[PDB]
Amino acid sequence: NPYERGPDPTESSIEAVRGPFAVAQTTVSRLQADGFGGGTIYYPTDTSQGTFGAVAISPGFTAGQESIAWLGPRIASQGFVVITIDTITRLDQPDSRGRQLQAALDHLRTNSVVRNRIDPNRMAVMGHSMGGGGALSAAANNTSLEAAIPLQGWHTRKNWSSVRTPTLVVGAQLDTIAPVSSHSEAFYNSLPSDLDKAYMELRGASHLVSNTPDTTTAKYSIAWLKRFVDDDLRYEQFLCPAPDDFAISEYRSTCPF
């Protein structure tokens, strides 16, 4: 596997706030951005091991970059190019949010500071609440995406039988804004039964768990991005079987992958 980056993983390594790769960040202004409201690109400086996969993360309704900013460097420090985006308007709906995620990804293909650091064939999308519903719409409109992770996602669309991208559904047990029963779990159930997928429910968590550094959210999101954006079979140990975490209230997967 030529896409493997960094040393072999442990529980502490996937839990670390910053991984091995030192990270730097560049900004894309609202004017510089074609198809989204701008954002911050986090990237590893060490290029000696090769290019990295790309990840785009979207915020929720009326939210901006800082609700998801802590995910940028945390994920990128494991060996990824991560752009956290602002939406074009504060009221953009989940279908629009999936486009701004794809436009942010495409913008990485031609970004000057990053395009030499990116493998444009291995990209993933992420999002909180409506940004999570957008992450599903971006996968449902681009079967070449390698991973999708809606974090407490929200969407009026319940049937996702057209997603072909390995998807990690992260719901919050005590979510009232987007309850897992009618949202997150409904998304996992309508995904293809043969798709490499997994539903993870965070114990005692509200809708706001992703707006602040949550280690459980970070560790499994890293494992998913490794196993699927890098095809890194070293990270399957953390997904198959069910993780032993009190932080996880429920878990269902298509393991082994």
Ligand SMILES: O=C(O)c1ccc(C(=O)NCCO)cc1
């Ligand atoms: O971001 C929020 O504060 C928010 C956005 C949308 C709703 C809503 O109307 N969803 C009903 C469908 O379950 C609620 C809260």
